[PDB]
Write an enzyme that holds these catalytic residues in place. Structure first.
Site, PDB file in Angstrom:
ATOM      1  N   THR A 174      25.768  10.299 -12.821  1.00 16.02           N
ATOM      2  CA  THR A 174      24.638  11.094 -12.409  1.00 16.02           C
ATOM      3  C   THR A 174      25.037  12.287 -11.557  1.00 16.02           C
TER       4      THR A 174
ATOM      5  N   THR B 141      26.115   4.337  -6.061  1.00 19.07           N
ATOM      6  CA  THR B 141      26.218   3.064  -5.365  1.00 19.07           C
ATOM      7  C   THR B 141      27.638   2.852  -4.926  1.00 19.07           C
TER       8      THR B 141
ATOM      9  N   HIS C 161      -8.507 -21.351  -5.549  1.00 19.64           N
ATOM     10  CA  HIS C 161      -9.379 -20.297  -6.037  1.00 19.64           C
ATOM     11  C   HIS C 161      -8.841 -19.833  -7.373  1.00 19.64           C
ATOM     12  N   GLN C 162      -9.615 -20.079  -8.410  1.00 16.50           N
ATOM     13  CA  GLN C 162      -9.169 -19.834  -9.754  1.00 16.50           C
ATOM     14  C   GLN C 162      -8.437 -18.530  -9.897  1.00 16.50           C
TER      15      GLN C 162
ATOM     16  N   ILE D  91      -1.238 -11.767  -2.681  1.00 20.02           N
ATOM     17  CA  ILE D  91      -1.592 -13.138  -2.330  1.00 20.02           C
ATOM     18  C   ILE D  91      -1.517 -13.368  -0.803  1.00 20.02           C
TER      19      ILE D  91
ATOM     20  N   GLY E 147      -2.053 -11.134   1.507  1.00 26.43           N
ATOM     21  CA  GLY E 147      -3.062 -10.338   2.218  1.00 26.43           C
ATOM     22  C   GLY E 147      -2.483  -9.356   3.224  1.00 26.43           C
TER      23      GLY E 147
ATOM     24  N   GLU F 269      20.119   2.356 -13.829  1.00 31.26           N
ATOM     25  CA  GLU F 269      20.728   1.764 -15.047  1.00 31.26           C
ATOM     26  C   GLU F 269      19.903   2.069 -16.318  1.00 31.26           C
TER      27      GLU F 269
ATOM     28  N   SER G 117      12.752   3.191 -17.179  1.00 31.83           N
ATOM     29  CA  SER G 117      11.755   2.490 -17.995  1.00 31.83           C
ATOM     30  C   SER G 117      11.430   3.256 -19.284  1.00 31.83           C
TER      31      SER G 117
HETATM   32  C1  LIG Z   1      -3.104  -2.262   7.890  1.00 35.38           C
HETATM   33  C2  LIG Z   1      -4.283  -3.172   8.141  1.00 35.38           C
HETATM   34  C3  LIG Z   1      -5.266  -2.750   9.021  1.00 35.38           C
HETATM   35  C4  LIG Z   1      -6.383  -3.550   9.277  1.00 35.38           C
HETATM   36  N1  LIG Z   1      -7.339  -3.134  10.191  1.00 35.38           N
HETATM   37  C5  LIG Z   1      -8.426  -3.926  10.471  1.00 35.38           C
HETATM   38  C6  LIG Z   1      -9.363  -3.487  11.391  1.00 35.38           C
HETATM   39  O1  LIG Z   1      -9.165  -2.485  12.083  1.00 35.38           O
HETATM   40  N2  LIG Z   1     -10.446  -4.272  11.665  1.00 35.38           N
HETATM   41  C7  LIG Z   1     -10.570  -5.495  11.051  1.00 35.38           C
HETATM   42  O2  LIG Z   1     -11.545  -6.197  11.299  1.00 35.38           O
HETATM   43  N3  LIG Z   1      -9.640  -5.950  10.142  1.00 35.38           N
HETATM   44  C8  LIG Z   1      -8.561  -5.163   9.834  1.00 35.38           C
HETATM   45  N4  LIG Z   1      -7.625  -5.601   8.915  1.00 35.38           N
HETATM   46  C9  LIG Z   1      -7.786  -6.939   8.240  1.00 35.38           C
HETATM   47  C10 LIG Z   1      -8.002  -6.821   6.709  1.00 35.38           C
HETATM   48  O3  LIG Z   1      -9.261  -6.293   6.349  1.00 35.38           O
HETATM   49  C11 LIG Z   1      -7.810  -8.189   6.053  1.00 35.38           C
HETATM   50  O4  LIG Z   1      -6.430  -8.393   5.893  1.00 35.38           O
HETATM   51  C12 LIG Z   1      -8.493  -8.321   4.702  1.00 35.38           C
HETATM   52  O5  LIG Z   1      -9.864  -8.484   4.932  1.00 35.38           O
HETATM   53  C13 LIG Z   1      -7.978  -9.529   3.935  1.00 35.38           C
HETATM   54  O6  LIG Z   1      -7.979 -10.644   4.799  1.00 35.38           O
HETATM   55  P1  LIG Z   1      -6.655 -11.535   5.087  1.00 35.38           P
HETATM   56  O7  LIG Z   1      -5.478 -10.646   5.438  1.00 35.38           O
HETATM   57  O8  LIG Z   1      -6.938 -12.519   6.200  1.00 35.38           O
HETATM   58  O9  LIG Z   1      -6.287 -12.223   3.681  1.00 35.38           O
HETATM   59  P2  LIG Z   1      -6.910 -13.585   3.135  1.00 35.38           P
HETATM   60  O10 LIG Z   1      -8.410 -13.644   3.343  1.00 35.38           O
HETATM   61  O11 LIG Z   1      -6.199 -14.848   3.585  1.00 35.38           O
HETATM   62  O12 LIG Z   1      -6.647 -13.309   1.568  1.00 35.38           O
HETATM   63  C14 LIG Z   1      -5.496 -13.882   0.956  1.00 35.38           C
HETATM   64  C15 LIG Z   1      -5.461 -13.726  -0.555  1.00 35.38           C
HETATM   65  O13 LIG Z   1      -6.402 -14.633  -1.105  1.00 35.38           O
HETATM   66  C16 LIG Z   1      -7.440 -13.904  -1.751  1.00 35.38           C
HETATM   67  N5  LIG Z   1      -8.698 -14.595  -1.480  1.00 35.38           N
HETATM   68  C17 LIG Z   1      -9.223 -14.930  -0.259  1.00 35.38           C
HETATM   69  N6  LIG Z   1     -10.395 -15.577  -0.444  1.00 35.38           N
HETATM   70  C18 LIG Z   1     -10.592 -15.680  -1.774  1.00 35.38           C
HETATM   71  C19 LIG Z   1     -11.626 -16.229  -2.512  1.00 35.38           C
HETATM   72  N7  LIG Z   1     -12.810 -16.054  -1.965  1.00 35.38           N
HETATM   73  N8  LIG Z   1     -11.574 -16.154  -3.894  1.00 35.38           N
HETATM   74  C20 LIG Z   1     -10.516 -15.546  -4.538  1.00 35.38           C
HETATM   75  N9  LIG Z   1      -9.492 -14.999  -3.789  1.00 35.38           N
HETATM   76  C21 LIG Z   1      -9.534 -15.061  -2.437  1.00 35.38           C
HETATM   77  C22 LIG Z   1      -7.359 -12.483  -1.204  1.00 35.38           C
HETATM   78  O14 LIG Z   1      -7.838 -11.524  -2.094  1.00 35.38           O
HETATM   79  C23 LIG Z   1      -5.862 -12.327  -0.966  1.00 35.38           C
HETATM   80  O15 LIG Z   1      -5.156 -11.973  -2.135  1.00 35.38           O
HETATM   81  C24 LIG Z   1      -6.533  -4.784   8.651  1.00 35.38           C
HETATM   82  C25 LIG Z   1      -5.547  -5.197   7.780  1.00 35.38           C
HETATM   83  C26 LIG Z   1      -4.451  -4.407   7.507  1.00 35.38           C
HETATM   84  C27 LIG Z   1      -3.488  -5.018   6.530  1.00 35.38           C
HETATM   85  C1  LIG Z   2      19.379   3.387  -5.793  1.00 33.14           C
HETATM   86  C2  LIG Z   2      19.998   4.202  -6.908  1.00 33.14           C
HETATM   87  C3  LIG Z   2      21.323   3.944  -7.240  1.00 33.14           C
HETATM   88  C4  LIG Z   2      21.928   4.656  -8.263  1.00 33.14           C
HETATM   89  N1  LIG Z   2      23.255   4.393  -8.566  1.00 33.14           N
HETATM   90  C5  LIG Z   2      23.888   5.103  -9.561  1.00 33.14           C
HETATM   91  C6  LIG Z   2      25.220   4.863  -9.866  1.00 33.14           C
HETATM   92  O1  LIG Z   2      25.898   4.120  -9.151  1.00 33.14           O
HETATM   93  N2  LIG Z   2      25.824   5.606 -10.867  1.00 33.14           N
HETATM   94  C7  LIG Z   2      25.109   6.579 -11.548  1.00 33.14           C
HETATM   95  O2  LIG Z   2      25.585   7.270 -12.439  1.00 33.14           O
HETATM   96  N3  LIG Z   2      23.806   6.806 -11.239  1.00 33.14           N
HETATM   97  C8  LIG Z   2      23.181   6.084 -10.256  1.00 33.14           C
HETATM   98  N4  LIG Z   2      21.847   6.357  -9.986  1.00 33.14           N
HETATM   99  C9  LIG Z   2      21.145   7.439 -10.777  1.00 33.14           C
HETATM  100  C10 LIG Z   2      20.085   6.843 -11.689  1.00 33.14           C
HETATM  101  O3  LIG Z   2      20.707   6.150 -12.747  1.00 33.14           O
HETATM  102  C11 LIG Z   2      19.166   7.932 -12.233  1.00 33.14           C
HETATM  103  O4  LIG Z   2      18.233   8.282 -11.245  1.00 33.14           O
HETATM  104  C12 LIG Z   2      18.429   7.434 -13.466  1.00 33.14           C
HETATM  105  O5  LIG Z   2      19.366   7.469 -14.496  1.00 33.14           O
HETATM  106  C13 LIG Z   2      17.206   8.285 -13.819  1.00 33.14           C
HETATM  107  O6  LIG Z   2      17.570   9.652 -13.944  1.00 33.14           O
HETATM  108  P1  LIG Z   2      16.969  10.814 -13.003  1.00 33.14           P
HETATM  109  O7  LIG Z   2      16.908  10.305 -11.579  1.00 33.14           O
HETATM  110  O8  LIG Z   2      17.848  12.048 -13.066  1.00 33.14           O
HETATM  111  O9  LIG Z   2      15.516  11.078 -13.637  1.00 33.14           O
HETATM  112  P2  LIG Z   2      15.199  12.316 -14.644  1.00 33.14           P
HETATM  113  O10 LIG Z   2      16.197  12.453 -15.760  1.00 33.14           O
HETATM  114  O11 LIG Z   2      14.940  13.640 -13.964  1.00 33.14           O
HETATM  115  O12 LIG Z   2      13.800  11.811 -15.245  1.00 33.14           O
HETATM  116  C14 LIG Z   2      12.679  11.798 -14.381  1.00 33.14           C
HETATM  117  C15 LIG Z   2      11.530  11.090 -15.056  1.00 33.14           C
HETATM  118  O13 LIG Z   2      11.309  11.674 -16.329  1.00 33.14           O
HETATM  119  C16 LIG Z   2      11.557  10.704 -17.331  1.00 33.14           C
HETATM  120  N5  LIG Z   2      12.189  11.271 -18.560  1.00 33.14           N
HETATM  121  C17 LIG Z   2      13.360  11.981 -18.600  1.00 33.14           C
HETATM  122  N6  LIG Z   2      13.611  12.294 -19.891  1.00 33.14           N
HETATM  123  C18 LIG Z   2      12.627  11.799 -20.679  1.00 33.14           C
HETATM  124  C19 LIG Z   2      12.412  11.864 -22.055  1.00 33.14           C
HETATM  125  N7  LIG Z   2      13.237  12.585 -22.824  1.00 33.14           N
HETATM  126  N8  LIG Z   2      11.280  11.249 -22.580  1.00 33.14           N
HETATM  127  C20 LIG Z   2      10.402  10.583 -21.756  1.00 33.14           C
HETATM  128  N9  LIG Z   2      10.629  10.544 -20.398  1.00 33.14           N
HETATM  129  C21 LIG Z   2      11.718  11.149 -19.858  1.00 33.14           C
HETATM  130  C22 LIG Z   2      12.438   9.663 -16.647  1.00 33.14           C
HETATM  131  O14 LIG Z   2      12.311   8.421 -17.262  1.00 33.14           O
HETATM  132  C23 LIG Z   2      11.863   9.640 -15.273  1.00 33.14           C
HETATM  133  O15 LIG Z   2      10.660   8.930 -15.279  1.00 33.14           O
HETATM  134  C24 LIG Z   2      21.216   5.642  -8.970  1.00 33.14           C
HETATM  135  C25 LIG Z   2      19.897   5.912  -8.638  1.00 33.14           C
HETATM  136  C26 LIG Z   2      19.288   5.190  -7.621  1.00 33.14           C
HETATM  137  C27 LIG Z   2      17.852   5.532  -7.339  1.00 33.14           C
END
Ligand SMILES: Cc1cc2nc3c(=O)[nH]c(=O)nc-3n(C[C@H](O)[C@H](O)[C@H](O)COP(=O)(O)OP(=O)(O)OC[C@H]3O[C@@H](n4cnc5c(N)ncnc54)[C@H](O)[C@@H]3O)c2cc1C
Ligand SMILES: Cc1cc2nc3c(=O)[nH]c(=O)nc-3n(C[C@H](O)[C@H](O)[C@H](O)COP(=O)(O)OP(=O)(O)OC[C@H]3O[C@@H](n4cnc5c(N)ncnc54)[C@H](O)[C@@H]3O)c2cc1C
Ligand SMILES: Cc1cc2nc3c(=O)[nH]c(=O)nc-3n(C[C@H](O)[C@H](O)[C@H](O)COP(=O)(O)OP(=O)(O)OC[C@H]3O[C@@H](n4cnc5c(N)ncnc54)[C@H](O)[C@@H]3O)c2cc1C
Ligand SMILES: Cc1cc2nc3c(=O)[nH]c(=O)nc-3n(C[C@H](O)[C@H](O)[C@H](O)COP(=O)(O)OP(=O)(O)OC[C@H]3O[C@@H](n4cnc5c(N)ncnc54)[C@H](O)[C@@H]3O)c2cc1C
Lengths: 113, 387, 386, 387, 388
Positions: free
Chosen positions: D127, D159, D282-283, D341, D343, D367, D370
């Site tokens: 690259t 790398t 929860h399903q 999952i 949260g 490598e 996609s």
């Molecule tokens: C960056 C950040 C800032 C936040 N700031 C605030 C804030 O300022 N004030 C505040 O009040 N809160 C705040 N929160 C809390 C936030 O709104 C809660 O995290 C959110 O409501 C989900 O609750 P939980 O994290 O307890 O997850 P949980 O309720 O434990 O959810 C866990 C997983 O189970 C799923 N799940 C839970 N119950 C069910 C069920 N009924 N059926 C199917 N699936 C279910 C959920 O979708 C989730 O994937 C903040 C959270 C974050 C991450």
């Molecule tokens: C953590 C990390 C480690 C790496 N280590 C190595 C390494 O050790 N050795 C090495 O050689 N390289 C390394 N790379 C480089 C890496 O392999 C390249 O980033 C990768 O090949 C994608 O190429 P690009 O970044 O130049 O994307 P680009 O070629 O600019 O493409 C950008 C976007 O356009 C898409 N695209 C490009 N052409 C087409 C097309 N003709 N049709 C449809 N879509 C297209 C690509 O899929 C991508 O989504 C590393 C990269 C990372 C992020």
């Protein structure tokens, strides 16, 4: 409200005859021939002709609001008024207390009756 | 000024009529017509009597002169009953649109007028056996010869193709292949009883079966010069201008079907019990219904947006191709899920959902496929960012 | 009437200010603030000055008194620049909403009034280490004890938790575990320097790192009966009621970041070349771009709709949960997609998209997770068929 | 013959070593190394000691002489601990492969042997800022000047780029832009401390933060003709052929990350309660975990398929690109869902899933992207049908 | 043992070629007529019996070949590629046979499996009812023991081969107490179709697999001899349950057969239809679609192979068969609609092969356990690894 009163009641206040639950209507001059749907079938009436008639299901098939005419109807006028004007009160000694939700062959014809 | 998602009272009364006719007259026989594949004449004549067809036709041709928005709210209703019958009566706006957007004053009072007088059908003939998506690979030739043109070729998949009084016809004007598409094609108004014209047998498709679709062969077909739309080379603009006002209506069709799918799946989910509970008490099914509801509501707004933009004088290519791609897509997603929720019954031919799956697939193909919609959107999108 | 999708002239004015702030003042420092994670005090104050904060406060109390549709406008523009920044700002409306919808004139003049006179902050305290989604699961206790209550418990994840003047607090005021949500919770306003209130360390999250999110405990915190919101035990109705007017705006936040993701990605595809061609000229990338456009347009309309519904008088619950659900999901799709288009660069901190992806996950979690949103919609939807 | 999905007894014990290592030695320090970005030298050395690195190196240089299937099953157990630390170990085999497949016995015993003797790192260099995906667009100059070549240009994203004893380097020899990739580029081995080589700083990425990834500049660098791999303009074949035996292990990385995210969400969903029930009751959470476990199991068989194909003399390309595309996509799907999952806890740094989500994203990119994985699959596939 | 292998036994390569030659020379040419008419494909079924591609689970001591689940999957994939309606009719036999195989005694197996060995008779799995399909435990068809017989009263729904069957495997409710659990409430019978009381319903009209007959069957006082009960009274639910290990993969192979047909169609066509100057395959989006479609099929194939290999190894394979039937069914639908799509307007048309594949495929997400049901099973199996 599932009432079935307004027609009747209007007819009383004007002291006009009423032709309730009509399945059919005709003018015979200064008289209306009114067919009506009663429990066993159809009774026929004749009414002096300031009259009051309440439509029953059977009477007709209503027409569609035709698109053209929906437009044409936006032109036609609608005076908008109050009951207060016509000389009518409104105060009501009815009041709703509540609106809840619905819930041998010798027993059965008893529990249909 | 201000966002509003509320209809005019006029549109409400339109919707109410469209909807009374859909539930009352279309649905109760829609399976019958899907089964026999018979063209639904009594309904088309009724819809015409109600004023629900040819809705774009301007007032000075005895039309109603109504918006793209109105068509869309109407046609969502017709589609909900059946997309076969909605497509049939939609074929008219399609065939008519070029003439409405590109026809002169005699062209307009001639070919639009008659639609006002009886219920006649018209169709739009562009697709050929060798080209659909690549409209610019149309090879039906059209030669000037005195006071008229000589159309030779073959058109495929034409709605109302065997039921039309007349056709919008797009044909290759210029033999030069270096010719720019934009100036290479002429578009005509072509009466259907013209000699040379050979309509084909009814095409038997998987879906929208009661709609009429067929190939047409044109041989040495004499088209009077005063039925040319704007001039020579002009057709391509003409044909492309049409879509602005018709793509929204096709999308509105799709949601119709999706809404039907949603209601059918929601009613059944409230009746059927599994493991001692209604299907709605199964979180997976609720989740399913939620998502269907989400997809419908957004699909709906999207076509509503495209209809509003063109109705506002702006062109809507971006928004309209958004609406068709999404609507098309979610109509299909919704059809299968409705089948799935109904289960075994849904896969059966006396339940009403199986038809929706078959009817739905079309919406990812005609009026521009899901792929070419995304090229259109991508092109409009990209252009917003370049100098 | 008719449908309209045009902003009002005065709205465009708001949008114009907000865009100009976001692009001229937020964007230039958003990455430093993401690296350091320090609370963006200047830009807050600045938002405050330009009038892009506390938009919901009625003119009554020296607020600008705008609707949800206006708050959404501005929030999308701010979020386009940065959702960390834009979150901290919306934090204040979250706190305000329960007082706005359910306070008396004293409570409003007192606690909303002061926000008008200076750029004070405030926070919404409901979530707890043991309950978030399940709000009827909150255990923080309030015991009535004279002309005042005593608060005990622990809240968690509080936006502005450690930067606020006062808190909406919601607590379990009925000890009988058999009592319903409707009767069991009381909602309070709570001055932050009240003794007992212990504010925790800053939390360290994947994204919106400049946002202040933290835990906070309450040890015998005393709250006057004057500060109860509607009455004892109306906490639930109240806390719930806030969501109609906040969720639409959280979704506009999501749309902002989506728009940003797509803009970055589109600029890059127009200038990057592979196999002899601009990325734009690969059908795959085009299709990606188009699909992202779609998502955004749709996500935006969804929020615009919910907002209008609530501004129009009616409950927007079904509509607001659809907008949250979809804007949140498509934000996450757009951001990882935008990273994808930039390729190696995309994964790199010196580029703008990697940040977007870390920011955007939150929008499927806070204010009701994608799953909870869907329960709500299913509920609203289904009830329309019996 | 007959299908089998059972490991050799040896393969089973190789797996146990790697799993003992990852769960005891990698896991308890992985977030620390992530938080800091410190290149994890103790763990590399430790992995070297246990024979879990350079596993492809033949026996006649003192390496284990293992196959691609073996390296895959090792590589998963490592990734499950950390894809930061296992990407650094894999880097070695990426640098080593174009020497394994295309180097002469001198080349192998010198440059592979030292790898076998101590814990050295090597790297892979193709690259450039200008190109990664389009390998046939690399511009690094390789001019024939003496009993050597002079190397001018710049590699990016390498790398172990800052940690390698030597490099497999690929540079463009024929300067005629009209030459094919087939004939245009040369593969080289290049001792890291050669003068003219300026190594840039550690780049900072969203994830695999402990992996060392940088730019190398190549000012006038002098490489012995001895360090050529087969000859002029044969570099493209060699670098393309390397991928058969490497693309599978990258996929196995993705799966390790996926398997980790599954377990964490499962462990949690069996402890967190909401609305009176465990998450798992929860399903919808059940259906997520079920769609997750499906996805891990299918990606595993896919990488296993492709390892087996090549381990048995066969060309990989279709099966390797399938598995790379799929493992990559689903790891990303698995990581958000696992964050989901958990949260709010998921979104926070004190929990293991936030890392997984940021790590997971390079699997759609490096490598082979996609997008290009599908161009490869497409191609291999269409080719079974061209008569 | 040895490591992995994805290599067919020579003998299995031989089974493969026979099924293919049949599918390709005999089914393909006629599937669209039989699909158009719903005509039950009697010749093809007799020809598949002739060729020993049918009843292959039957053990050697009842006159069968005693082939495994892997062998049976190979063969179905091949038949299904030709036609799913046909292959479903063939396959039904194995489903009916399976509880008798896994749970029948020597007199039961010899008698009822054995007759399948000497004429192309059909049999059917009689479980689903108007009111219960997914919830097996919700079925109410009555069986009361009256003498040394049982008397069956009930109605059955969606029975493949239901009006073509020499006998039925029938699942019925033995215990009147509604509180009686599924492990006690049900008994499985072998019932001969020609028993008095049995009324075969009309041919039911579905979107897909139209040549397969699927039918309602009503039992009105049906007399069933004590010796036709499977393990005994109350074993019914375990016996029906157990049939699935050996059968899920094979229906998954069916979904894969149709999936592969869709791919091959859509590929052939994208190598001749051009638009915008180029062939379809040179448009990247189409190519990507073919690519993802090819992934999907390879992965489904391995999935059902894996399920089948697990049970042939003497392991219970619930978890792996459920992934197969979930994944194979979801992708068969995906591939079908894409195949249509790629053929544009022609694909929606009835003189082209693909619309049918789309109508055919949806049933794979419904029967032999819905997509949702499969996820519940997979979930349950997955989570139990973590409960300790
Ligand atoms: C960056 C950040 C800032 C936040 N700031 C605030 C804030 O300022 N004030 C505040 O009040 N809160 C705040 N929160 C809390 C936030 O709104 C809660 O995290 C959110 O409501 C989900 O609750 P939980 O994290 O307890 O997850 P949980 O309720 O434990 O959810 C866990 C997983 O189970 C799923 N799940 C839970 N119950 C069910 C069920 N009924 N059926 C199917 N699936 C279910 C959920 O979708 C989730 O994937 C903040 C959270 C974050 C991450
Ligand atoms: C953590 C990390 C480690 C790496 N280590 C190595 C390494 O050790 N050795 C090495 O050689 N390289 C390394 N790379 C480089 C890496 O392999 C390249 O980033 C990768 O090949 C994608 O190429 P690009 O970044 O130049 O994307 P680009 O070629 O600019 O493409 C950008 C976007 O356009 C898409 N695209 C490009 N052409 C087409 C097309 N003709 N049709 C449809 N879509 C297209 C690509 O899929 C991508 O989504 C590393 C990269 C990372 C992020
Ligand atoms: C029921 C029905 C009714 C119809 N009614 C009418 C009508 O009344 N009037 C009329 O003019 N036509 C009508 N048509 C034709 C229809 O409009 C076309 O089929 C449609 O435009 C697609 O064109 P095509 O079928 O030729 O497919 P093709 O153009 O061959 O496309 C084949 C496939 O490749 C894709 N593809 C093509 N080009 C590209 C490319 N550039 N990049 C990526 N993918 C590409 C397509 O999306 C499709 O999936 C009708 C068709 C049907 C099926
Ligand atoms: C063509 C065809 C052939 C058939 N052949 C046979 C055969 O010969 N032998 C036989 O016995 N049966 C046969 N059947 C019946 C078939 O197996 C059943 O239809 C299927 O098993 C489940 O069907 P159902 O209609 O009862 O689904 P329902 O129980 O009505 O389920 C409907 C929907 O609800 C969902 N659902 C139900 N319960 C839950 C839950 N607990 N959690 C989450 N989602 C749930 C399902 O996924 C489904 O989408 C056949 C069916 C068809 C369509």
């Amino acid at each position: 409200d599932d009432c079935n009163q307004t027609g009747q009641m209007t007819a009383g206040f004007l002291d006009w005859p009423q032709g309730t639950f009509a399945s059919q209507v005709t003018l015979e001059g200064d008289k209306l021939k009114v067919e009506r749907a009663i429990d066993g079938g159809l009774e026929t009436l004749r009414l002096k002709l300031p009259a009051v008639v309440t439509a029953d299901l059977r009477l007709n098939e209503p027409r569609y609001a035709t698109l053209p005419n929906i437009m044409k109807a936006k032109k036609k006028k609608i005076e908008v008024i109050k009951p207060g004007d016509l000389g009518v009160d409104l105060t009501s000694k009815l009041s709703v207390i509540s609106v809840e939700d619905p819930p041998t062959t010798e027993d059965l014809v008893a529990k249909l009756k | 000024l201000g966002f509003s998602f509320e209809f005019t009272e006029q549109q409400k009364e339109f919707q109410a009529t469209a909807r009374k006719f859909a539930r009352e007259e279309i649905i109760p026989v829609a399976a019958e017509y899907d089964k026999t594949g018979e063209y639904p004449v009594p309904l088309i004549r009724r819809a015409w009597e109600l004023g629900l067809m040819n809705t774009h036709i301007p007032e000075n041709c005895g039309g109603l002169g109504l918006g793209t928005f109105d068509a869309c709210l109407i046609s969502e209703e017709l589609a909900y009953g059946c997309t076969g019958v909605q497509t049939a009566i939609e074929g008219n706006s399609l065939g008519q649109m070029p003439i409405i957007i590109a026809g002169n004053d005699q062209q307009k009072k001639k070919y639009l007028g008659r639609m006002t007088e009886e219920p006649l059908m018209c169709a739009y003939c562009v697709t050929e056996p060798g080209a659909g998506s690549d409209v610019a690979g149309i090879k039906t030739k059209a030669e000037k010869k005195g006071d008229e043109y000589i159309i030779n070729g073959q058109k495929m998949w034409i709605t109302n193709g065997g039921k039309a009084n007349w056709y919008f016809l797009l044909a290759r004007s210029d033999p030069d292949p270096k010719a720019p598409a934009n100036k290479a094609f002429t578009g005509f108004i072509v009466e259907a009883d013209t000699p040379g014209i050979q309509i084909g047998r009814k095409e038997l498709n998987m879906g929208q079966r009661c709609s009429d679709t067929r190939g047409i062969v044109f041989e040495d077909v004499k088209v009077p010069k005063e039925n040319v739309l704007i001039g020579d080379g002009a057709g391509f603009k003409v044909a492309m201008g049409a879509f602005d006002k018709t793509r929204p209506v096709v999308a509105a069709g799709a949601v119709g079907l999706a809404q039907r799918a949603l209601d059918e799946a929601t009613k059944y989910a409230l009746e059927r019990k599994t493991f001692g509970k209604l299907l709605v008490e199964h979180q997976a099914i609720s989740f399913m219904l939620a998502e269907m509801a989400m997809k419908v509501e957004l699909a709906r707004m999207s076509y509503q947006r495209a209809a509003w933009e063109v109705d506002s004088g702006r062109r809507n290519t971006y928004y309209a191709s958004i609406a068709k791609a999404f609507a098309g897509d979610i109509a299909n997603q919704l059809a299968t899920d409705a089948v799935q929720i109904l289960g075994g019954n849904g896969f059966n031919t006396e339940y009403p959902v199986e038809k929706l799956m078959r009817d739905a697939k079309i919406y990812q193909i005609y009026e521009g496929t899901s792929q070419i919609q995304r090229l259109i959107v991508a092109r409009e999108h990209i252009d917003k960012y370049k100098n």
